[PDB]
Short mmCIF file of C-alpha atoms and ligand atoms in Angstrom, two decimals:
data_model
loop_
_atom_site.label_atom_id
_atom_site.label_comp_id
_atom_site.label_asym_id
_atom_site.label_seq_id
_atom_site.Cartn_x
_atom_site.Cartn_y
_atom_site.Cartn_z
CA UNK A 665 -55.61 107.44 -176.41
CA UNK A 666 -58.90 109.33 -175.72
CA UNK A 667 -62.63 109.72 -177.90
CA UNK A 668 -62.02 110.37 -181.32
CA UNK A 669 -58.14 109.49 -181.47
CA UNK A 670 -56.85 107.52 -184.38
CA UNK A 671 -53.78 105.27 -184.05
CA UNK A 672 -52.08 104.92 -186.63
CA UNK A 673 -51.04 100.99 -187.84
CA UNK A 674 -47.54 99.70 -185.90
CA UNK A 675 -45.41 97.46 -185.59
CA UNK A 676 -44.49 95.32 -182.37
CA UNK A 677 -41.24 94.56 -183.56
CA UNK A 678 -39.02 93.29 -186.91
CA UNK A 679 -37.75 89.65 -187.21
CA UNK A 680 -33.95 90.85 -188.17
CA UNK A 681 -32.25 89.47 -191.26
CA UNK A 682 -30.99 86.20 -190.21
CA UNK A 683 -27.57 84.66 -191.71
CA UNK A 684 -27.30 81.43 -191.81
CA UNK A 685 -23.98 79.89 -191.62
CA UNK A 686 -21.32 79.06 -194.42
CA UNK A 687 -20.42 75.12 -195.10
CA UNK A 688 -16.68 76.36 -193.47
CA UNK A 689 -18.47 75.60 -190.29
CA UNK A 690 -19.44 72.71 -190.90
CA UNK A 691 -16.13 72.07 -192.31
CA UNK A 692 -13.43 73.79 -189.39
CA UNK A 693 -16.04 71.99 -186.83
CA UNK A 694 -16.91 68.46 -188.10
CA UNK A 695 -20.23 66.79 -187.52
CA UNK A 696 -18.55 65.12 -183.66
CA UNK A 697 -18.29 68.55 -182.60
CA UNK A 698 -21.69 69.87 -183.94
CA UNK A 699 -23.65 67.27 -182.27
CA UNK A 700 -21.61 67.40 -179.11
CA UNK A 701 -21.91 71.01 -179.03
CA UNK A 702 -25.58 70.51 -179.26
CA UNK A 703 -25.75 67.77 -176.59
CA UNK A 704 -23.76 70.12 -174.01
CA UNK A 705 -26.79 73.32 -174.86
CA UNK A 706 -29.08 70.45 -174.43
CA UNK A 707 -27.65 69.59 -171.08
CA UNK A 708 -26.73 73.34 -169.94
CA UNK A 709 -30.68 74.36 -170.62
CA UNK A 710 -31.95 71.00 -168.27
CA UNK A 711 -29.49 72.75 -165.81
CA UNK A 712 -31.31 76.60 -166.33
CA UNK A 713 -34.01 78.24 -164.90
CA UNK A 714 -36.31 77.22 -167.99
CA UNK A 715 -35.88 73.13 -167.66
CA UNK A 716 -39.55 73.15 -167.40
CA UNK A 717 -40.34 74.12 -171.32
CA UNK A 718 -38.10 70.35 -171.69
CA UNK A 719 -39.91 67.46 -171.73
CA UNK A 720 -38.27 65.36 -168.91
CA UNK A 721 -38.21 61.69 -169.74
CA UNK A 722 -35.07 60.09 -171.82
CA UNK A 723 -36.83 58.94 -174.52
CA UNK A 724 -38.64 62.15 -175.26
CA UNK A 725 -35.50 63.98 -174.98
CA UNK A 726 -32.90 61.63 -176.80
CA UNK A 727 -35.44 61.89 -179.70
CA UNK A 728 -35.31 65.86 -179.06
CA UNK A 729 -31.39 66.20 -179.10
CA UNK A 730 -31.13 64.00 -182.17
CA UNK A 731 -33.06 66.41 -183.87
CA UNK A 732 -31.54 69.26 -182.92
CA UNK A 733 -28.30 68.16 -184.01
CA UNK A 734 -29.32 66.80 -187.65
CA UNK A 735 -30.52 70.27 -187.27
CA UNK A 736 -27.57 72.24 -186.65
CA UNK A 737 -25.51 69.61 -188.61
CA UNK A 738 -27.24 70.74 -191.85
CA UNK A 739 -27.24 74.15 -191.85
CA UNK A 740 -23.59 74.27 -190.78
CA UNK A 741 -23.40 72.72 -194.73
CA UNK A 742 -23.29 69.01 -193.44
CA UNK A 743 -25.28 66.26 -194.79
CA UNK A 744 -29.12 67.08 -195.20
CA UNK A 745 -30.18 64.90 -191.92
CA UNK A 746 -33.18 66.95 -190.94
CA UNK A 747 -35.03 67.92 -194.00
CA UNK A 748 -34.79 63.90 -194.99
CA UNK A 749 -36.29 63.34 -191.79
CA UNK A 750 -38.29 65.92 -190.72
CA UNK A 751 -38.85 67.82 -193.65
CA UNK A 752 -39.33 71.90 -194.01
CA UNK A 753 -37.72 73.29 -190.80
CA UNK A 754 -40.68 75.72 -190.07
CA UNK A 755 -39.04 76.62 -186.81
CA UNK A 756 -41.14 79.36 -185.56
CA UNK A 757 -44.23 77.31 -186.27
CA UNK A 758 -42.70 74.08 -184.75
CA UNK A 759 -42.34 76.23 -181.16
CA UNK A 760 -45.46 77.40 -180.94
CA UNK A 761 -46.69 74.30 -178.56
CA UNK A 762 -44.12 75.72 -176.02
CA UNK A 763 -44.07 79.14 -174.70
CA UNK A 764 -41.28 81.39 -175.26
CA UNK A 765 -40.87 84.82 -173.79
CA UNK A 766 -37.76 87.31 -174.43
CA UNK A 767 -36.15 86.44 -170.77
CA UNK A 768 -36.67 82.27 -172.40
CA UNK A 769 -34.56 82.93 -175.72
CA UNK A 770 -32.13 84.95 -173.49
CA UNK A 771 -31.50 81.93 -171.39
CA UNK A 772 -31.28 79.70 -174.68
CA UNK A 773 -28.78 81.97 -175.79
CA UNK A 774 -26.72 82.19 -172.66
CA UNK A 775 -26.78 78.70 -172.37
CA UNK A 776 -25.36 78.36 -176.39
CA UNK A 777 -22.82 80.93 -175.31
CA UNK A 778 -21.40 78.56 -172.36
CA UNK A 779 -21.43 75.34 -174.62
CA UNK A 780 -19.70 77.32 -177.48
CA UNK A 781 -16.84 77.92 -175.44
CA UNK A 782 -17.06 74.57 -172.73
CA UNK A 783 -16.75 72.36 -176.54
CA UNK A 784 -13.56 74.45 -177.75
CA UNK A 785 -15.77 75.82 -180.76
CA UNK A 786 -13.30 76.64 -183.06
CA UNK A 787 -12.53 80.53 -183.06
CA UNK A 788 -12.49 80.97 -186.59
CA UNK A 789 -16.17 80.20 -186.85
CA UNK A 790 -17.52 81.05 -183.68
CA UNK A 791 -18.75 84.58 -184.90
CA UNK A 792 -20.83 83.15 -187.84
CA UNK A 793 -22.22 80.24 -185.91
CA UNK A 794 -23.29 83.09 -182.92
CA UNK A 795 -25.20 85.46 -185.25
CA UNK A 796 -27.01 82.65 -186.91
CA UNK A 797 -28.65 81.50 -183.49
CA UNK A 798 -28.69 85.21 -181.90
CA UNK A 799 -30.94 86.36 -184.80
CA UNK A 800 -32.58 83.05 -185.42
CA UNK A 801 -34.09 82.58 -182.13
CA UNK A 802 -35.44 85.99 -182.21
CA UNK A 803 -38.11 84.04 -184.15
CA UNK A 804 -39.19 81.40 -181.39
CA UNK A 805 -40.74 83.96 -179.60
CA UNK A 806 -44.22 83.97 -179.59
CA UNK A 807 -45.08 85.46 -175.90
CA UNK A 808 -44.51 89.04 -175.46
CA UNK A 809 -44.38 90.72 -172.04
CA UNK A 810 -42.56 94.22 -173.20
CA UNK A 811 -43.10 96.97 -175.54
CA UNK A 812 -39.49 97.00 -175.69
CA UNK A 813 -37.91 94.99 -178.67
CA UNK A 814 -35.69 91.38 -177.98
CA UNK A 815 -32.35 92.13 -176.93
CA UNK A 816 -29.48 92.07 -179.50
CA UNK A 817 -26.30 90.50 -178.75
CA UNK A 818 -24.05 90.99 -181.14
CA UNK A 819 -20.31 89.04 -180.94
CA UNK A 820 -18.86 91.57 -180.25
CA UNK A 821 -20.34 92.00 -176.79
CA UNK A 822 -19.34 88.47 -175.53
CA UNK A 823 -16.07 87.94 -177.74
CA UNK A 824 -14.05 88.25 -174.82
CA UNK A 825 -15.45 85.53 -172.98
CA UNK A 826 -13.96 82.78 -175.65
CA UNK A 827 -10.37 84.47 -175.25
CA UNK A 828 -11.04 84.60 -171.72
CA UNK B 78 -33.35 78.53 -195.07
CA UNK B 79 -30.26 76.53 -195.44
CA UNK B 80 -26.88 76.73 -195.47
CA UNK B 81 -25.41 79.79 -196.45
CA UNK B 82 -29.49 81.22 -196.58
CA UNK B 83 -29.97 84.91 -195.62
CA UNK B 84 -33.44 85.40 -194.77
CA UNK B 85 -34.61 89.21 -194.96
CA UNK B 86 -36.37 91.00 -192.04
CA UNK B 87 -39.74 90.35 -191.99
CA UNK B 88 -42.71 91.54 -189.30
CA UNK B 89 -45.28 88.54 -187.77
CA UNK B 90 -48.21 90.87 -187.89
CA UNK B 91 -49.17 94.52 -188.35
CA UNK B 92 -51.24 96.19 -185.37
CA UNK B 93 -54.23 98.08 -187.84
CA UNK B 94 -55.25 101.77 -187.48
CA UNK B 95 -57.39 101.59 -184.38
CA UNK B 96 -59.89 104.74 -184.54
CA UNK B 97 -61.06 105.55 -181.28
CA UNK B 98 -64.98 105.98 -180.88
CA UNK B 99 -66.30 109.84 -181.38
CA UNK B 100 -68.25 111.72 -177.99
CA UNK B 101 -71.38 110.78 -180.29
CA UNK B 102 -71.24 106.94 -178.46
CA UNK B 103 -71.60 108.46 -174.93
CA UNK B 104 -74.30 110.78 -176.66
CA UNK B 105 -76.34 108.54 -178.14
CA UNK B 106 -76.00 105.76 -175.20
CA UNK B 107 -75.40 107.74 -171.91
CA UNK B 108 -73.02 106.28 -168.96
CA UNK B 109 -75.81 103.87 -167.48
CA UNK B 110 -75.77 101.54 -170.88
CA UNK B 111 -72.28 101.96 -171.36
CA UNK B 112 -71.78 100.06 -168.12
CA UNK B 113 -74.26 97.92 -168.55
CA UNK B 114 -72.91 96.98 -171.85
CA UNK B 115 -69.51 96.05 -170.11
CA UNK B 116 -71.29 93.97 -167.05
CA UNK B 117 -72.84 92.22 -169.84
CA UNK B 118 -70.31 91.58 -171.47
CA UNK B 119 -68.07 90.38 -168.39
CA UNK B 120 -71.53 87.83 -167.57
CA UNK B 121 -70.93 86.45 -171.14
CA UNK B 122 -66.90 85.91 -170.97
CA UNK B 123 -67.64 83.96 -168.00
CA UNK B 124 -70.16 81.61 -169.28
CA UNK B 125 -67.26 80.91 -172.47
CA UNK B 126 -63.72 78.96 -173.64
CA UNK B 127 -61.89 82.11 -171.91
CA UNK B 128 -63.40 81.92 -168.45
CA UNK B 129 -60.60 80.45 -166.78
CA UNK B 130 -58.72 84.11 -167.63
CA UNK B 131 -60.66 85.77 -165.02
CA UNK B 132 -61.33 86.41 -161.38
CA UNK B 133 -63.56 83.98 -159.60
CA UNK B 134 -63.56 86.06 -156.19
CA UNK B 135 -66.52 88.50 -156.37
CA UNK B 136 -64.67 91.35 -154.86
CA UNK B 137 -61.50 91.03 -157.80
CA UNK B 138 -64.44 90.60 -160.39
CA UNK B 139 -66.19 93.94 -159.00
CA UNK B 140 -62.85 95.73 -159.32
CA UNK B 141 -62.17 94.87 -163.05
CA UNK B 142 -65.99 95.01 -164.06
CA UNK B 143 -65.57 98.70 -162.53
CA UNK B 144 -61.98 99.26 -164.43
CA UNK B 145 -63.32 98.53 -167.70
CA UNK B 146 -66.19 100.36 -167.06
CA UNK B 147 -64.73 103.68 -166.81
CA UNK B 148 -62.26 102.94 -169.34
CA UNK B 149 -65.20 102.41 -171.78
CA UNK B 150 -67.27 105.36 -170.73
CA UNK B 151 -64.38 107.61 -170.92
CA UNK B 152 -63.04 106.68 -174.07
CA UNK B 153 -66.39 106.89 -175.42
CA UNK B 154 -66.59 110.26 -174.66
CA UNK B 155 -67.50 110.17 -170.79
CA UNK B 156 -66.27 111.60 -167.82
CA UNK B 157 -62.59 110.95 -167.32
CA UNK B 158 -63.32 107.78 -165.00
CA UNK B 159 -59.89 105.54 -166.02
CA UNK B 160 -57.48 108.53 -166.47
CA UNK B 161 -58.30 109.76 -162.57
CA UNK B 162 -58.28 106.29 -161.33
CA UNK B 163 -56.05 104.16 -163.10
CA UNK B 164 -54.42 106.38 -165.10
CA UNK B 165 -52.54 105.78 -168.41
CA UNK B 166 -54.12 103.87 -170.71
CA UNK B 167 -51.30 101.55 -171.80
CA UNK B 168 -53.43 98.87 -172.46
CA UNK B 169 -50.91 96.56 -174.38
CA UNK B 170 -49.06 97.04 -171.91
CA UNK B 171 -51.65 96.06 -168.91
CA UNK B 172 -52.58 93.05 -170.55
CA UNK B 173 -49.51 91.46 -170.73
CA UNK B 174 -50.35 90.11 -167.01
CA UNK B 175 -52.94 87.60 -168.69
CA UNK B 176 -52.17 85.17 -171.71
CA UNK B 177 -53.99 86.12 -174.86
CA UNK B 178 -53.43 83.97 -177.82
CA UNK B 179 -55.34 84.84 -181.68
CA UNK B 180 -58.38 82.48 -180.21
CA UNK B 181 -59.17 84.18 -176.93
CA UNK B 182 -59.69 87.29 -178.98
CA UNK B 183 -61.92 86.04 -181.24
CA UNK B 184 -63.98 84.45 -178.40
CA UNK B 185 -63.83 88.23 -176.43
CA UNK B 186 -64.91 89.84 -179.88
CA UNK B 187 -68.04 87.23 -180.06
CA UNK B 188 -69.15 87.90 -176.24
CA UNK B 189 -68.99 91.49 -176.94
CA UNK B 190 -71.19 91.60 -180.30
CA UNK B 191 -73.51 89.37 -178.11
CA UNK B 192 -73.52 91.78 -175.03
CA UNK B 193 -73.90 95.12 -177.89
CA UNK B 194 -77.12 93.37 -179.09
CA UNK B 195 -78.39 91.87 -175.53
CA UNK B 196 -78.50 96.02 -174.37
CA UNK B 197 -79.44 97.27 -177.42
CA UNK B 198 -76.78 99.27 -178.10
CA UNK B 199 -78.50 101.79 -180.38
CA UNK B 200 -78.00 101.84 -184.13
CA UNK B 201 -76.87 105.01 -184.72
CA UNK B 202 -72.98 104.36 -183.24
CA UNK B 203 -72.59 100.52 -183.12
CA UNK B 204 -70.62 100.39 -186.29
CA UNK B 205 -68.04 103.10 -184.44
CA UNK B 206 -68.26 100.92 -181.28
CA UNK B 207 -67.85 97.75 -182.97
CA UNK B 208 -64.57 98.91 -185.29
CA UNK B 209 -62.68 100.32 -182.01
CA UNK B 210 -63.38 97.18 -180.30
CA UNK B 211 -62.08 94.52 -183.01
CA UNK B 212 -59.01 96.41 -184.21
CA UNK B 213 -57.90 97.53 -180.61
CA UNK B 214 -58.23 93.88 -179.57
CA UNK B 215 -55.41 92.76 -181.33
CA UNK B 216 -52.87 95.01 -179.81
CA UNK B 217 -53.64 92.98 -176.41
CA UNK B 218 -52.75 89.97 -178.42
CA UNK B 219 -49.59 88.78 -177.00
CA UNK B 220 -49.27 85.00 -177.38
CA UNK B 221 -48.55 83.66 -181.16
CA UNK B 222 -49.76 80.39 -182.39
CA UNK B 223 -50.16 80.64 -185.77
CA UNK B 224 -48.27 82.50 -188.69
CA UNK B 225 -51.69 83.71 -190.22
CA UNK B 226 -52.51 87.18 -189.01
CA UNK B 227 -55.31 87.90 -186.68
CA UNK B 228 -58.74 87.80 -188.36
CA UNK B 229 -60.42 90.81 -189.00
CA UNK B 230 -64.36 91.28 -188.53
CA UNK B 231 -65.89 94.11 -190.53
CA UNK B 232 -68.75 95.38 -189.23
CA UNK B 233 -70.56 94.44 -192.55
CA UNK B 234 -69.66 90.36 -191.44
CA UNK B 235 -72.43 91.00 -188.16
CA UNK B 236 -74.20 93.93 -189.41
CA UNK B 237 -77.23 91.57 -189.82
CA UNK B 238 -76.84 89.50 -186.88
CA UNK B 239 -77.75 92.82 -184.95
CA UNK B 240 -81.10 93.82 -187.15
CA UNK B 241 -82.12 89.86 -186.68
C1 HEM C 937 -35.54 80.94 -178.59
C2 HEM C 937 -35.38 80.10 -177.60
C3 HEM C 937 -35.73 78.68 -177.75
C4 HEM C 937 -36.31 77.80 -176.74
C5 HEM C 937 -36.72 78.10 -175.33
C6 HEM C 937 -36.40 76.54 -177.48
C7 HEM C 937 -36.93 75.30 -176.89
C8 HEM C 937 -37.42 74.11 -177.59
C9 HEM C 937 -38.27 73.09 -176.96
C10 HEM C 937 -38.79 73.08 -175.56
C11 HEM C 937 -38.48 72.12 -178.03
C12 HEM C 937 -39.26 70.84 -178.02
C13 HEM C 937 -40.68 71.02 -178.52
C14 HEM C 937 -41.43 69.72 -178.29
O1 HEM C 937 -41.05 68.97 -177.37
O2 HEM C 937 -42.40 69.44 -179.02
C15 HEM C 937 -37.69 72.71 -179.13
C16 HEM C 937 -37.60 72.10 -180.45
C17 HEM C 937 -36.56 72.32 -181.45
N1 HEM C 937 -35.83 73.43 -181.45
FE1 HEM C 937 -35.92 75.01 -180.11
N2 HEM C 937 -35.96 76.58 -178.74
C18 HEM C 937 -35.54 77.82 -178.93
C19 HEM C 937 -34.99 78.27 -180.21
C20 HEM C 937 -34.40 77.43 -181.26
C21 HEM C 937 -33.50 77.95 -182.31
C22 HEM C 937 -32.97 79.33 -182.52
C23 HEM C 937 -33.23 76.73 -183.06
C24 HEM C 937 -32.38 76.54 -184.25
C25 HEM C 937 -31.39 77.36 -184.49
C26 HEM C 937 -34.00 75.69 -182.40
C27 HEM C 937 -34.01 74.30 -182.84
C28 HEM C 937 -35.02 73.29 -182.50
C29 HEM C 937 -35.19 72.04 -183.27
C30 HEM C 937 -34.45 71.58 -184.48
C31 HEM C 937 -36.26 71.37 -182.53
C32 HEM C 937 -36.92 70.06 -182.82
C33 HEM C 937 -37.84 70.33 -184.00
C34 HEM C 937 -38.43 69.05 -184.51
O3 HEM C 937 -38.97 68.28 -183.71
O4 HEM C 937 -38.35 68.83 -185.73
N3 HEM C 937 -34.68 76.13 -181.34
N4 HEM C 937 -37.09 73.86 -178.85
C1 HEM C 938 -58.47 90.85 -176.75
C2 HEM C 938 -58.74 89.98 -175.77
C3 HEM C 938 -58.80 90.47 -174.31
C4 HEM C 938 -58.77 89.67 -173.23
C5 HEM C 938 -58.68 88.13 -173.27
C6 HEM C 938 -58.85 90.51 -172.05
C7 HEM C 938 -58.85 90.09 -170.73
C8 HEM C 938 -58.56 90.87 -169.62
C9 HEM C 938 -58.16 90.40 -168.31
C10 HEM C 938 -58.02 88.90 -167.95
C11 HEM C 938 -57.97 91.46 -167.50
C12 HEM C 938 -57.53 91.45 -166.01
C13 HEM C 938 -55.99 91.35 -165.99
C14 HEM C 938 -55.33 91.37 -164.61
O1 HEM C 938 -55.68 92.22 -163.74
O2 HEM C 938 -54.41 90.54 -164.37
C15 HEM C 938 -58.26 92.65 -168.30
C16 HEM C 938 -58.19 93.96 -167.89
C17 HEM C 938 -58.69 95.04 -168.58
N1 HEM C 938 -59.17 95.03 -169.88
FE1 HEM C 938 -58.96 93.44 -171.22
N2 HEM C 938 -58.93 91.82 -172.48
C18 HEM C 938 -58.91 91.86 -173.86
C19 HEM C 938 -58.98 93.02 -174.63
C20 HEM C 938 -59.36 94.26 -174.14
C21 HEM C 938 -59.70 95.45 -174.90
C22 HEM C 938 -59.69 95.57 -176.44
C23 HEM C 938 -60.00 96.43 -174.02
C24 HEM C 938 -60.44 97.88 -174.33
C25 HEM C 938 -60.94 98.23 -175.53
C26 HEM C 938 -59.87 95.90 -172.68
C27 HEM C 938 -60.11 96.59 -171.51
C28 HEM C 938 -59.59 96.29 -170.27
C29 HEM C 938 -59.40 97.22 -169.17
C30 HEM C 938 -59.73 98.73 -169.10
C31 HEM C 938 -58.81 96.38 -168.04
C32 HEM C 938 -58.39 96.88 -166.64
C33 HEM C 938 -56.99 97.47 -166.79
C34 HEM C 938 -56.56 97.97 -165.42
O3 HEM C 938 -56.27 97.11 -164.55
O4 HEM C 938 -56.53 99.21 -165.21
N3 HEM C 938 -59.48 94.58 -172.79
N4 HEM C 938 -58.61 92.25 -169.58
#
C-alpha cells in the first residue's frame, strides 16, 4: 500500500456450504432428546465465558430456549414448530442485535460439543448433526477481529471425545 | 434452509478495488493542507453520531490526529511519515481495536467530504482523493448489521455539493 497502488477487489472470507441435517436425526434422536439437548447448550453457554451475550432473566430466556429447540426440532425433520411460529429463520440477520466474534462461535461450539456427548446423542447421527452447526454458525458472525478465516472443526477432530 | 437443505457457499460482501491516490495529490495540495485536511476532519468526527469512538484526552487525540496525518501525506505521495513511524500499513488490521459497523462509515465518509470542501481541497485531485477514501473505508468495516452491502458514493453523487 503506497501512492498510486491499486488493490485489487477481495474477499474477507466464504460462508462454507452448509448441510443441513437428514429427518434420520430427527428420527434416531426424538423430539425429548432434541429439546433436552438444546436446554443442556443453553445451560453450558450461561456457565461460559460469553453468559453476557444471554439475556439473564427467566422469562426472557425460557422464551429463548423454546425457540431454539422448535428450532433445532425442525430442521432435524421434526414437526415445523418454528417457521409456524416465527416464520423465515433468517438466522444471520436475527443475530445481528448481539455481537459475535470468531473466539464467541468457538465457545458456542465447544459448548454444543459438551452437551452432544453429556445427552448420550446418539452416535449414528452425531456427525451430521455436528457439521450442520459447525458450518452454520460460521454465519452468526458479524464482528471480525482477524484477517485469518473462522476456524474449521471438522468431526473428525473431536470424534474421539464421544468414544472417550 | 430446512431439513435435508444444502445451502452453497456464499461471501457477505466484496472489499472493491481500492486505487490508491497518484503523487499528483501531494503536488497539487502540499503537506501543510494535507494535514490540515485531516485535523479538520478529526474536529468534524467529534462534533458527530461516531464521537464516542475516539479519544477525549488531548494528548491520545494529538497522537492519532498526528498518525493519520502522516499516513495521509505519505500515501498521497509525501514523505514516508507512517512507514518510519508506525510502520506497516495494515490498516484492516489496526482498526479492528475500534467497532465499525456499515453506519459509522457512512458518517466518517460525510465528515470527510465536509472537511475536503471546508480546506478547499483543490479541484484538480479531489475526485482521486475522494475514490481512495470511500472504497478503502470499507475494508475497516468490521461489524455486520445488515445483509445489504456497504453503500457506495461515486464521486458524481457529491461532485456538486463541492462547486456549491
Ligand atoms: C455462532 C455463535 C452463536 C452465538 C454466540 C449465539 C447466541 C444467541 C443469542 C445471544 C440469542 C438471543 C438474541 C436475542 O435475545 O434477541 C440467539 C438467538 C437464536 N439463536 Fe443463536 N447464537 C449463535 C449461533 C446459532 C446457530 C448456529 C443457530 C442454529 C443452528 C442458532 C439458533 C438461534 C435461534 C433459533 C435463536 C432465536 C431466534 C428467534 O428468536 O427466532 N444460533 N443466539
Ligand atoms: C471507516 C470508518 C473509520 C473509522 C470509524 C475510523 C476510526 C478510527 C479510530 C477510532 C482510530 C483509533 C483506534 C485506536 O487506537 O484504538 C483510528 C486510527 C487510524 N485511522 Fe481510522 N477509521 C476509519 C477508516 C479509516 C480509513 C479509511 C483510513 C485511511 C484511509 C484511516 C486512517 C487511520 C490511521 C492511519 C489510524 C492510526 C493507525 C495507527 O495507530 O497507526 N481510518 N481510526
Amino acid at each position: 500500500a503506497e501512492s498510486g497502488s491499486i488493490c485489487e477487489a477481495r474477499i474477507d472470507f466464504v460462508f462454507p456450504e452448509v448441510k443441513f441435517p437428514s429427518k434420520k436425526v430427527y428420527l434416531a434422536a426424538g423430539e425429548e432428546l432434541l429439546r433436552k439437548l438444546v436446554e443442556v447448550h443453553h445451560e453450558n453457554l450461561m456457565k461460559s465465558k460469553i453468559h453476557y451475550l444471554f439475556p439473564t432473566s427467566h422469562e426472557q430466556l425460557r422464551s429463548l430456549v423454546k425457540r431454539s429447540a422448535d428450532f433445532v426440532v425442525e430442521m432435524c425433520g421434526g414437526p415445523p414448530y418454528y417457521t409456524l411460529t416465527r416464520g423465515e429463520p433468517k438466522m444471520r440477520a436475527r443475530h445481528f442485535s448481539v455481537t459475535i466474534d470468531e473466539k464467541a462461535r468457538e465457545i458456542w461450539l465447544a459448548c454444543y460439543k459438551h452437551a452432544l456427548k453429556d445427552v448420550h446423542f446418539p452416535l449414528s447421527v452425531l456427525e451430521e448433526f455436528w457439521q450442520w452447526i459447525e458450518s452454520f454458525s460460521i454465519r452468526m458472525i458479524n464482528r471480525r477481529t482477524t484477517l485469518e478465516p473462522p476456524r474449521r472443526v471438522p468431526y473428525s477432530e473431536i470424534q474421539d471425545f464421544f468414544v472417550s
